[PDB]
Model the fold of this input.
Amino acid sequence: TKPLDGINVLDFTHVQAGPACTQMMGFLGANVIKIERRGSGDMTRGWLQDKPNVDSLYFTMFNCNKRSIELDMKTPEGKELLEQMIKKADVMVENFGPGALDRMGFTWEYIQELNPRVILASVKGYAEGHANEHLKVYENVAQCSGGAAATTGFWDGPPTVSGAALGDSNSGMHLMIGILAALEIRHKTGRGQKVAVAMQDAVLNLVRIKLRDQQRLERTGILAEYPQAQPNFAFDRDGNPLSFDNITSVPRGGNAGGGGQPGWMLKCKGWETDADSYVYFTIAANMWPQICDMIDKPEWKDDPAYNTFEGRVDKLMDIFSFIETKFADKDKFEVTEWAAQYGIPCGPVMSMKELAHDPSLQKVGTVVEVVDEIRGNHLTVGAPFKFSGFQPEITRAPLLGEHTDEVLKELGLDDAKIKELHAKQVV
Amino acid sequence: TKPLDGINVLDFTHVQAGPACTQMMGFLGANVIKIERRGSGDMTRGWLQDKPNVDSLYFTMFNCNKRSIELDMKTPEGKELLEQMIKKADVMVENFGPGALDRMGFTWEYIQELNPRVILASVKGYAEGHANEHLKVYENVAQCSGGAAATTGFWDGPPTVSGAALGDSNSGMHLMIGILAALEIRHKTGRGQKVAVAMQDAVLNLVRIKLRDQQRLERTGILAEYPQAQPNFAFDRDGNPLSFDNITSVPRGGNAGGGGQPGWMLKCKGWETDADSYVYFTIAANMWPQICDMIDKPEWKDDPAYNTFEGRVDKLMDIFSFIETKFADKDKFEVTEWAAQYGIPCGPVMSMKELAHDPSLQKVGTVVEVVDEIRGNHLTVGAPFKFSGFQPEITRAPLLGEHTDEVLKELGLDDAKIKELHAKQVV
Ligand SMILES: CC(C)(COP(=O)(O)OP(=O)(O)OC[C@H]1O[C@@H](n2cnc3c(N)ncnc32)[C@H](O)[C@@H]1OP(=O)(O)O)[C@@H](O)C(=O)NCCC(=O)NCCS
Done:
């Protein structure tokens, strides 16, 4: 009915990486109890707010399907409460930076003694045992540490950060694989495990195709399909030409295909006026004829300077310029619909405005209107996994300490034991 | 002792998205049996080969921990073998493009009739029921459909793809979450499920913070922390300033922070000839004092134009421009180490060559040497999740059809039948 119904998650996480993971577990039915610092709670609450003294969108789009309890974990009575909650939890999730939980008294070793069944899941910057184990890491630092930044953007520009959250949310989703894997192993052992994802490794996993390319480069000295391998196409900022004579580490390739077969980002009508008025167009080698028909170049079906991967390298960027020319007069949608007639893989650059209001994404539950009576409704990204046997029921993100008392009742605490704790500045 | 021990995966997948997912399952212990086209098989085998007549690195770095059987599924005899295999399978992963398996005869409904326990997992371009459900989609096409390209690169350049495989490996990791969540649910119901991830939605899920930004922009007309909101810093290509006056959809922000904590990509010594000689440098709020001592500008500790996020977010670029000057004569690693002395969140852009031979990434098992006695050893990325109770065991990718016979014999077949199928050109 819902894969994580009845899994309870003691969630210590803050910001993006850890909360993204617990939220998505929440969307699959887990009972996520989020533990927050007394007074402020999760930073994201006060970051980039749109209305004052209202939880930010940063917070709400990463914290639906959870309850909040405030807790000072430095206090004798808070540690006592934690022990009870650990005994009821299936997974504890944390992204606190190294040794921190151990310093609260909750080493993996003691946790095992409190609940041999509980899984301990962590996000960190670097793996345990890495020389950089101790370094401090946010989204873009991890994109840098993991290879994305070096391999993204252009040959004549800097390393470029990706808009997508290659380091926070992607670590989050990786962690969520770890957690589920550990739940799968517990069915056979009766025991919990420790599991950790490092932002660098999560990034690296997504840039695995670039570690393909580094080895290709080391062994052959060239990467035929990169723009720098087309003679006198690519120039550094001083007008000097670029080739694989000089390159010993995988370079930026602009809008080249990557793991996609050859491709490029082509202008559509209005690109001067509209930043996102562009398609991506792919030359699959198996599609050469189809493409010649579309662009009205029958002469290129048989010329061997044009009809194999190999002949095409001499000229790839000239081909792409010539295709661009046909799109000169059509918006990205006309171009995608035209391309689709030929089966060619080609699609528009969707702007975020287009995405936030697309009827298709709301039909399938991928953009979702969350009903929030307190802060006002708001959009969010649902579950990118679709299942035959159930639908996520997303509900609004918790207010600070909203559920503190309700959670203490589920633990078995009389109403005056709760009164004590508020006054003691534990909760 | 290995989370997917005894899970049997009927793997139909090719290229990157699907295989990434089944490979990672194989690392966690799954019995992955890859079905391949008679004669050529997975097209990655012959795409960017480094040695002739040898499976490429693209194939080997996405197809460890699997066996190969060749099979013609359009044949009566091959459908019969498929039915037998589906009855032994726990999960059946596919990325064929829509309706394809249904046309082979294996609709979800017949599959259930064969095995009410099997999970059917799919990668698709767009979600079932989306207007674009039928479009063909590779890596960078999905990056475009999902919002990443629109929000990646610079305000004065084109939408830009990421070097990270946001569309393929990303999608395959999200699928892997769907698969594990379905295995968790099957312990409770005894039943399999259908599960699908669309590349558009996998991308969009990593781009959630950009949906936060769209809504902030819609509600307030401005994004204070984006470069375009510091007066006269940002210019479009032909001499004209840029502001949020004109911007209704989240724009490209160069190497801005992404979140609530501003950062930039900063030149280090050697940048004019070394593409990856840069550092990312994040102004955390709490860390401004320490930033002021590393810099040796102590005037900024009490100047309110300088010591608050509100004070800071109109001179932000001037500030990075001056921190950058401190780094002109030091490298990457020097700068980072200077910055760790103050717990400042700063790190190097790692190059792919630095990462390919980094000793830490090899010690923690994230870059792993694969022992491949037929093609030569090669590197690959291993498990990004680290577990206290087991270690993945990485084992080389299969030769086309290497395991056909072996797998037919596990299907209870007879050595006469086997040699008949080879001859009948079905295997
Ligand atoms: C995000 C990150 C950089 C934030 O750093 P930070 O502002 O220093 O916050 P910390 O996580 O280190 O926690 C602050 C301290 O207060 C403690 N603390 C936090 N909440 C508490 C509470 N509810 N009660 C008592 N103590 C608490 C922590 O144990 C920690 O203790 P310490 O002084 O012994 O180190 C850090 O958590 C991190 O690098 N984690 C891994 C990677 C990551 O998630 N970063 C990207 C952000 S999405």
